[PDB]
Design a protein around this ligand. Structure first.
Ligand SMILES: Nc1ncnc2c1ncn2[C@@H]1O[C@H](COP(=O)(O)OP(=O)(O)O)[C@@H](O)[C@H]1O
Ligand SMILES: Nc1ncnc2c1ncn2[C@@H]1O[C@H](COP(=O)(O)OP(=O)(O)O)[C@@H](O)[C@H]1O
Ligand SMILES: Nc1ncnc2c1ncn2[C@@H]1O[C@H](COP(=O)(O)OP(=O)(O)O)[C@@H](O)[C@H]1O
Lengths: 54, 42, 374, 373, 374
């Protein structure tokens, strides 16, 4: 078919799909972000690289 | 310049695919046609 | 979509990955290759182009000379680099670079001027509003969930181990080794000649790389595994070529990755990765070594060989003192972990202060990146 | 749009000609030139120095037939000029100054052939533009696919060329000097065993008609020898022009078998199936499985009944067993080249590729190597 | 009871040379072709020869189908190769094979089955007392008499470059190219096709090889030479067939060997021989490179075209840094040079302890060749 979604499914190999599913299941970015303590601790840490660089 | 000296680039294959079908249409439809008549004849 | 979201682009020697800020997964992953035709082309009226880029280049492998624009983590052909970035922005992501900021990753130790070039062709041609450059291996530690530990990243172009203490890296203890997956592919092609099979062109190198990705593993003990292969024939696998031929590689499955631990096979002076990270730990202070042993994180494509973690742990425990405890950390998605770290770094509200403004670049020239980026 | 171009196919055996954009050629006629050899006694019948084409075929009793094209090479240029004049004026009835012409010739040919062809088509007929193309590329146009290896067998020469995605590999082009004329000569040689003797050039056409009518390619050679030795069911009867009746029998499947085993003619070269397989193996690794699935037959010599099954079986035997071999033989494969010519001649993007008359004037006849292929 | 001098047998593809140890020049030189008849023998009382071997087979080329037992330096027909070895031992040298040691040569990167089969068929059939296998390029540099240099041997079948510094050979810097005399003969046939001459049979392939040997040269400037050939007809030579027919080559004289420096004419994507030598040099360590720039050695029959040395010196000087001197060493008798070195290696009193003994072969099998010789 002429749709780019159908060609998107047609082109890419199986291992890329396997990796996409694997790292879509765990959702690492969401786990780092919406967890409050670690997220705002890196917030503060980046604050002191601003303080420290110049 | 040496790999594709003989042909022009950035041409759609759909044009060739259309023309082959157009020529096959005459075979399917069994068209009567004559050749181009000359201007000096006219 | 309502607000402009930054673009996270991870660009190594092997493949290029690109996605949006805060997303779980990158949208596009494709090999970093630019191909050009070599054979005479006589078919007028159909599709021919002077250069093929991306996955389309690897599709038509049989009529191209594949050419990697990034060599050993250093960009050596900038026109092909611009073509790769254009294909990344427009063909795959289909978003204009002028609306959104971009975030790039780069090797720890490198020529200085490369960063300047990465500045100059990013503001001048693509007209981005802002960018930032970050070290590749720090993002692995950020994505793993740890602010303190030593991380090894061995991509397709370069291997480097950096120790990070309290989320804030140590420059003097950074160790860089020029031994990566491409040299392993070349060694595998060289040792596959001894069985009779010959591979010489670029497409054959791609096929050999596929063979390496399919059937390789790291032995727990080299001598015992070699004697085991000397005993029986249970260590034989058959791979079917795109021609239709079948080859039986057999003994070479654990000899190709063993060059990572014994680089004397290639003739290089430097020794293996395990003593490299051991020396990187020993270059640090005594007080912080306890946290560094317990927080060792593996990352990069080359570190996906089966059995790499057990062999690495055994070697580094043999090197380490007996009273110290060793913990290796092997994420199941380590191959993309750097990009995941980038997605963390583009979502922090403090990171809005990190961006290099276009006006600042216009004021300070291409040398703004050394003072702005750490 | 404006004036249509001319498509002319000059094989070694028969000449074909028509207008571009047409389905089938208007004029199809053998490429022979005949001259009389006996005494002429009837005063007032008029004189005729040469007989060209089909007119020489009907009055072939009192002529010595001569072929201007031999093994794909033009040996006698005067007879080629006569054939081209007859084609332009008596068969198509068009002035050559108004039309561009597209010509066909073999892959590997001497340079002087192309140079003299360009000089003849510009100097005498005064055509405004002209072009030369390889016949098998035009066969791939006729098939309609972008990828495949194409094997064309005419009356003069057999050649295989593989093309992948519009790019043609020059080092994998194979040329073999085994064609229909050699098979006709071998049939003339093996018809001696039963007592029939054909010597003069008039009887060569009779032998060619016998070959076209009552020959077929055996699937298994030794089994057919056993069958023809056991019974008389394989014999067929043919009627000569003078009224005698001949009966071939065993020689029906021995003449076309010689393509697959050229040692019958004394040639050292390999068969057509091995030539196609070797030309495939000369290519790169990644395109071989595409070439296995798109083998195209072209030319009149491949019109024997049962050629496709024998070719598929032989190439299946030679190739690795894990892949599929399919042979694509269109029923109208005799005129495939000409059909491809039409498809090429009236493309919109092809109109910039004609060799202009001014370019020939300012460059000499050497311009055809820089353009064309 | 003096020890008898050993036998030196050089076997590249397409020519076999043999002689006694300690002599200046080989006793026997003959092509490595074997022919079999294809036509029917109708005269009764004729001799019954199944196979014509060697130089004799080149006398009656008209009635045989010539074949080569070696393809690209790999012996593809062992039972056929036994005929060449038997004819060498019994008819040319007419020596007893059980009485003298035999020294043999091969290409660098070959399958191990080649060496093992050579050792097995030398001990088991001809019953030699001792044997040895030596790499050809080391023998050529022995013949040149210098203990440090890079040598590029180009013979019918193979081209290979090895560097040696102070008696040490770097294994990772060895490069091998499958661009040789037979491919040039095939290309000469292909380009002689368009002049108007056609050669198809292998008996005509020998004639084309003779034409290549008699009338070829390498031009210093390729474009200027083509312009000169187009402008005037002074660069024309005539040759007589065995049939007896004057043919004129003209332009194709300097185009057949030019494919050595530009392999893209054949369709191969590999680099030229000059860039192969340069890449082999740059793969070595820094402190030896100057010496390797001063001791380039040419060897093999394919390097016997006039003007190869000047063209290669010019090209390497165009690639190398300007501050060094590039010297090309080409002895006049370089075609035999490999064999000459073997004789020297067969005459040293130090070498005599390192022959592969039959007794140790009896318990080590044919795998002792990998343990004993390089
Ligand atoms: N599953 C696997 N098994 C073995 N090797 C792999 C695997 N995946 C990737 N590799 C190797 O790693 C390389 C890709 O490394 P990658 O991490 O993509 O580099 P970067 O991301 O730094 O560009 C490939 O060239 C391949 O040789
Ligand atoms: N129907 C047929 N069956 C078998 N052989 C044929 C048939 N038609 C033609 N031929 C053979 O093919 C030859 C004509 O081939 P042709 O396509 O005219 O070659 P070209 O056009 O290249 O000169 C004849 O000499 C004859 O030997
Ligand atoms: N005098 C010469 N001039 C040019 N080329 C030559 C000459 N002699 C031999 N050759 C080429 O060199 C090849 C012979 O190579 P040779 O050195 O005999 O290989 P090897 O010794 O490894 O068998 C022949 O194929 C021929 O093409």
């Amino acid at each position: 078919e002429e749709d780019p979604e159908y060609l998107r499914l047609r082109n890419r190999a199986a291992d890329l799909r396997q990796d996409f599913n694997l790292m879509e299941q765990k959702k690492r970015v969401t786990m780092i972000l919406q967890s409050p303590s670690f997220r705002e601790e890196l917030e503060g840490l980046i604050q002191e690289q601003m303080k420290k660089g110049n | 310049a040496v790999p594709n000296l003989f042909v022009p680039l950035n041409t759609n294959p759909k044009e060739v695919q259309e023309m082959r079908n157009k020529i096959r249409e005459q075979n399917l439809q069994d068209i009567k046609t004559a050749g181009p008549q000359s201007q000096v004849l006219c | 979509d309502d607000d402009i979201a930054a673009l996270v682009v991870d660009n190594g020697s092997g493949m290029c990955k690109a996605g949006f800020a805060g997303d779980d997964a990158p949208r596009a992953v494709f090999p970093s290759i630019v191909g050009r035709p070599r054979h005479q082309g006589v078919m007028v009226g159909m599709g021919q182009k002077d250069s093929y880029v991306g996955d389309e280049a690897q599709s038509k492998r049989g009529i191209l000379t594949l050419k990697y624009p990034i060599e050993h983590g250093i960009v050596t052909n900038w026109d092909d680099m611009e073509k790769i970035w254009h294909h990344t922005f427009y063909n795959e992501l289909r978003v204009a670079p002028e609306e959104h900021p971009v975030l790039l990753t780069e090797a720890p130790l490198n020529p200085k001027a490369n960063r300047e070039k990465m500045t100059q062709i990013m503001f001048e041609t693509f007209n981005t509003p802002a960018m930032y450059v970050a070290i590749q291996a720090v993002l692995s530690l950020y994505a793993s969930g740890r602010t303190t530990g030593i991380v090894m990243d061995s991509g397709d172009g370069v291997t480097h181990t950096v120790p990070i203490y309290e989320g804030y890296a140590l420059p003097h203890a950074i160790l860089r080794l020029d031994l990566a997956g491409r040299d392993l592919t070349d060694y595998l092609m060289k040792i596959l000649t001894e069985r009779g099979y010959s591979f010489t062109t670029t497409a054959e190198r791609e096929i050999v790389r596929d063979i390496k990705e399919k059937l390789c593993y790291v032995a727990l003990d080299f001598e015992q595994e070699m004697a085991t292969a000397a005993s029986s024939s249970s260590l034989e696998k058959s791979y079917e070529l795109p021609d239709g031929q079948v080859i039986t590689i057999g003994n070479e499955r654990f000899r190709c990755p063993e060059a990572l631990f014994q680089p004397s096979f290639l003739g290089m002076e430097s020794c293996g990765i395990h003593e490299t990270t051991f020396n990187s730990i020993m270059k640090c202070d005594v007080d912080i070594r306890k946290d560094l042993y317990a927080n060792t994180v593996l990352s990069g494509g080359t570190t996906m060989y089966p059995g790499i973690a057990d062999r690495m742990q055994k070697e580094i425990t043999a090197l380490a003192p007996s009273t110290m405890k060793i913990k290796i950390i092997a994420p199941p998605e380590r191959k993309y972990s750097v990009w995941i770290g980038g997605s963390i770094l583009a979502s922090l509200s403090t990171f809005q202060q990190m961006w290099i403004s276009k006006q600042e670049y216009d004021e300070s020239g291409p040398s703004i990146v050394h003072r702005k980026c750490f």
